[PDB]
């Protein structure tokens, strides 16, 4: 029992885990940025349809809170598709627009018809 | 902002495998690669630190402590020296003449580097140009262009 330093450091006391008697909130918050909530509607513009037929990419207006990862999961789940990459820009309207390019197994123009944009 | 050169003196810690570096006020004759020896049993040549109780009368020292363990306060502007007058081995008080001419009594166990401070006689060359004065005081503080009171308003 030898003090080799002229300093007194606070002894490392134990700190227990929480085992709470009741949960603060009754139910977990059901998620509101789901697949349908995240993809609002496709753009049907001159540009968008020109992008569809020339670059093999869809143009959606996307919920402003959403990541590229959440978009890429959503379109895959909502259209039975595969995505090369997603590129997002926030417009001067205060709404996101997500260019979802498809992997070459799927044609944008084949998918545009069945979702109902032409 | 200062006249005298400093000196980065590397000692080795007696207690752990560190190395300590202290900035000193350089005495005229300190060079790089020189050994300096600090404490009681250290010898009396220029650059060494030893208490003013353990050195003869007429020892020209500089960077002299005023209270024992305050790390040196008196005689540390460029080309200054606080010479030792006499001792009092009982009660342990040593007279020292200071750069002004004041002869103060100090507690005899307090340390000082031997020899006069480096960068001496630098108040001999004339500034000549207001620009040199500007460039001097710009390193120190906002004090230079002194407006004399008599020109100012009441």
């Amino acid at each position: 029992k030898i003090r080799t330093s002229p300093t007194f450091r606070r002894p490392k006391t134990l700190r227990l885990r929480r085992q709470p008697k009741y949960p603060r909130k009754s139910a977990p918050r059901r998620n509101k940025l789901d697949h349908y909530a995240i993809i609002k509607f496709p753009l049907t513009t001159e540009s968008a349809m020109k992008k569809i037929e020339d670059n093999n990419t869809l143009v959606f207006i996307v919920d402003v809170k959403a990541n590229k990862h959440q978009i890429k999961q959503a379109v895959k789940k909502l259209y039975d598709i595969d995505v090369a990459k997603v590129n997002t820009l926030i417009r001067p309207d205060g709404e996101k627009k997500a260019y979802v390019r498809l992997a070459p197994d799927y044609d944008a123009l084949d998918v545009a018809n069945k979702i109902g944009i032409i | 902002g200062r006249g005298a050169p400093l000196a980065k003196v590397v000692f080795r810690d007696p207690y752990r495998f560190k190395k300590r570096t202290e900035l000193f006020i350089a005495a005229e004759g300190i060079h790089t690669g020189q050994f300096v020896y600090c404490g009681k049993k250290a010898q009396l040549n220029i650059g060494n630190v030893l208490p003013v109780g353990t050195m003869p009368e007429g020892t020209i020292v500089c960077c002299l402590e005023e209270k024992p363990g305050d790390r040196g306060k008196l005689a540390r502007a460029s080309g200054n020296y606080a010479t030792v007058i006499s001792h009092n081995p009982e009660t342990k008080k040593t007279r020292v003449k200071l750069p002004s001419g004041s002869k103060k009594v100090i507690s005899s166990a307090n340390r000082a580097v031997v020899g006069v401070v480096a960068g001496g006689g630098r108040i001999d060359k004339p500034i000549l140009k207001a620009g040199r004065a500007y460039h001097k005081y710009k390193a120190k503080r906002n004090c230079w262009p002194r407006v004399r009171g008599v020109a100012m308003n009441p």
């Binding site: 030898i2 330093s5 002229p6 | 007696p14 207690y15």
Partner: protein, 225 residues
């Protein structure tokens, strides 16, 4: 059998030579602010000129007698809070179908039976946290002719009862076969405390300088001889 590659290596731990070892620094530690407080509270109590009313609590009962006293005290305990219920189990055999001597605990209910001539021996703890609670009971017990002793540890005297601490503990009565043990206690305690009372009252404690201030005085004393 003696391997010639095993070699003795000396460490010269003199000034400016070798890195010093890991020795005990329990003396030069910068302690927390509370440890430093309670330590140089115990130093103040040795330097300062302490009055005999406070100081009289540092003349404490000896180890030999205190063991004999707590051996006697251990038979006349108050009942535990769980001991009380099995006495109420023993109610119904006449009800649904003469009280023993204990130690009178606390200061108020010992003070009221020192003034009343109802205490045969009064035990006081030496270490009451505010001392104003207990300062007077020496005077009371002496004046009213009650034999009293001062023990170390209110924690020890509170373990007689079934609580943490208890400042004062009195013997109001004992049984016929345990009369003799109380009799031989009061003899050696009443000769010790109650009869030395003109001596105790004029005896100032403390006023002892530090060991290196004493050792400087002793050097100055043998410097003129």
């Amino acid at each position: 059998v003696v391997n010639p590659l095993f070699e003795k290596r000396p460490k010269n731990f003199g000034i400016g030579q070798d890195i010093q070892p890991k020795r005990d620094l329990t003396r030069f530690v910068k302690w927390p602010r509370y440890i430093r407080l309670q330590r140089q509270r115990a130093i103040l109590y040795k330097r300062l000129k302490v009055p005999p009313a406070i100081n009289q609590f540092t003349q404490v009962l000896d180890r030999q007698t205190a063991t004999q006293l707590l051996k006697l005290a251990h038979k006349y305990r108050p009942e535990t809070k769980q001991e009380k219920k099995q006495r109420l189990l023993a109610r119904a055999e006449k009800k649904a179908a003469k009280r023993p001597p204990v130690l009178r605990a606390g200061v108020n209910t010992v003070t009221t039976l020192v003034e009343n001539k109802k205490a045969q021996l009064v035990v006081i703890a030496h270490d009451v946290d505010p001392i104003e609670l207990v300062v007077f009971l020496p005077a009371l017990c002496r004046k009213m002719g009650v034999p009293y002793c001062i023990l170390k540890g209110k924690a020890r005297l509170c373990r007689l009862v079934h609580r943490k601490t208890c400042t004062t503990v009195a013997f109001t009565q004992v049984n016929s076969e345990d009369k003799g043990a109380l009799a031989k206690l009061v003899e050696a305690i009443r000769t010790n405390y109650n009869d030395r009372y003109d001596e105790i009252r004029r005896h100032w404690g403390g006023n002892v300088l530090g060991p290196k201030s004493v050792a400087r005085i002793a050097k100055l004393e043998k410097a003129k001889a």
